[PDB]
Amino acid sequence: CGKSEAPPPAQTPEVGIVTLEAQTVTLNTELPGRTNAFRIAEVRPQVNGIILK
């Protein structure tokens, strides 16, 4: 009336294995910055006087 339930040893399954190999790949870097015009000219008067038009 007892001395039962022998525990089975585990087989340790389900290990999805990926092997590794040498592989060349290029590297990239992200850098922060701003945008600028190719050419920007602020017009400045080369004479004196008042604006008319």
Binding site: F38, R39, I40, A41, E42, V43, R44, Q46
Partner: protein
């Protein structure tokens, strides 16, 4: 012609010869030359801009 007339004629000629060099150096300033050799950075000012 007297020697005095040749003297002050040559003086006025050398005076005008100095004035044309004074204009030629101002022509040389309108094409700004690199005063030394080496690397240059980016242009902080661009075309179409007024400089003084």
């Amino acid at each position: 012609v007297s020697k005095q007339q040749y003297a002050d004629a040559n003086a006025a000629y050398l005076q005008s010869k100095a004035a044309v060099e004074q204009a030629r150096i101002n022509l040389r300033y309108t094409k700004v030359l690199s005063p030394i050799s080496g690397r240059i950075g980016r242009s902080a000012v661009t075309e179409g801009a007024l400089v003084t």
